[model samples]
Target: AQNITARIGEPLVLKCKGAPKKPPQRLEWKLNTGRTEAWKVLSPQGGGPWDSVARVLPNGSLFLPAVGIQDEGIFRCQAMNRNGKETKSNYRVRVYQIPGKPEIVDSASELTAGVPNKVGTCVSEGSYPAGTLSWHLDGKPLVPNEKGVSVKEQTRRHPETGLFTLQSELMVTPARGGDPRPTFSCSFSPGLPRHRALRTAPIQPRVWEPV
Candidate 1:
């Protein structure tokens, strides 16, 4: 079983593949908090000690909805049949704070007071697992490519651990300084929502000025 990390508003799918190469007669997902036994419930059988939180798809995958910080912890899946029972497999879910408050990184200061070029540079740093980056305008989705927006990827290796970390930046040409049109936002993963532990920059107007 592999561990998964997600940010706020991100869907965290938990895949429960067995080790013996077979599906368990009864697949159960148990949540263990600080207590010895939290609660247990069978899959797909609703209205009991546990609800049907997951379903074993045709492809033998367990699908979980968007995960949150409180949902973070260890999960175990036990398999059993009429004949006997198989070993149980455990999975872990973790949530990291989503990158917060992106800052202008491009030549924002060099812009001429009345220059006609609509350009802006922004970045969010120091996030774990290198969360995603996205762009939005005035509470609506904005396609960077459609608007001639350009963004680049970057990676850095830790000196001690040599672990590579990454982040993305965007260049947007604002219609005007302190542009009051549609707000632009930078996000990590757009299709997926962020989790509770994570934080994201609000979707508003240009960072140059308040929306």
Candidate 2:
């Protein structure tokens, strides 16, 4: 019935569409996911292990006290009127998980003066639908794709966790004059206000300054 984008670890409510109010209706719900992509009946009391906190409400709605990244799939809500007229609503759900603390790793320890080269790669894991990365120099944001500056961003999924791991490489000319002693760090998801950002490390690049 609708496409939904929900945040992980937060309350999720899927309202039923076309539910008749005047006539009492019988409701059944099935929430599907990768682990159990098949349609499994939702218990009026609660759903199974993965969604143990799910509830099929009397008003033909489905509720989950909290959402998990694994809960992304088709959710079907069925309602039957007294005369045996049944209607089903299918909801496409997508879950987004907040990224964890990011760290600079496995990149060049130093930079070549006056040359655009990769300084470091920052990594943040356990984010759903992947995440974003932005580079900062001396605590100031840097613009990419300008002045030969480029940011290489890569997204990979964890085999077991089914979550996303984001990596970003900061490449720029290490000029000697501008912003001397430049410290570099990367942030994941630039516009996160209700959540804390996942930027935690700043590395001091040892640039080849003296000739």
Candidate 3:
């Protein structure tokens, strides 16, 4: 058994190497879509839907030019020698994609100096496997308040696209302020290079002026 991870729209190859007493005469590749109980052959010789994108090489390896979420599942490779001896290998494939930009839907527009309570919410929509969210205040890590103020995270999958939506809330009680207008940064990590979602907003002080 083997495990493989790949990004969407990327190429992937699964190799099955076996040495038998006699040269193999036939090679075949099959797929289990998980939606169904039956396994279907995906090789070019099988004349299946995947024949256009999947190919079996002379070495009994399976190749996919462009992988997608629909291509993820268990793949099986079978090799048979002229003497009727057979060998089989199974591979589990997983696919991932980069998420879109995150949105700060409920960020604070004004903050009061020495304030004891503040809250903001960040969201990343249309992602796979969800994403991680973190908060920063004035270029420093902001810890959740111990006095009933806290940070929370939630994720849900879209029924149609099978993508995920992640939402996080940051609650803090600011004790001090060095800058009149401080910046708060929210970042989302999707576990890939150049695949982070980030947004920054300024926290302005609420000034009380004589009318």
lDDT of each: 0.50, 0.75, 0.68
Where does candidate 3 stray beyond 4 Å? 19-25, 35-38, 42-44, 52-59, 81-88, 113-118, 143-148, 176-181, 191-211
Identify the leading candidate in terms of TM-score: 3
lDDT winner: 2
Candidate 3 lDDT by residue in tens digits, 66-175: 88777778998787655577778888887877667777776666655454445577788877656687777667766665644478889898887778888888765554
TM-score of 3: 0.71
Which has the better lDDT: candidate 1, or candidate 3?
Answer: 3
Superposed Cα deviation of residue 194, candidate 2 (Å): 6.6
The residue-by-residue lDDT of candidate 1 on 54-111, one tens digit each, is: 4444333455554544556777767543436465767777665544555544433333
Q: Please estimate how well model 3 matches the true structure, expressed as its whole-model Cα lDDT.
A: 0.68
- Please give the lDDT score for candidate 2: 0.75
**Alpha-carbon RMSD to native, per candidate:** 12.3, 4.5, 4.5
In model 2, the runs with Cα more than 4 Å from the true position are 1-13, 17-24, 28-59, 63-67, 74-92, 107-110, 190-196
TM-score of 2: 0.67
Q: What ranking emerges by TM-score with the best candidate at the front? A: 3, 2, 1
Give the Å error, residue 40, model 1. Answer: 29
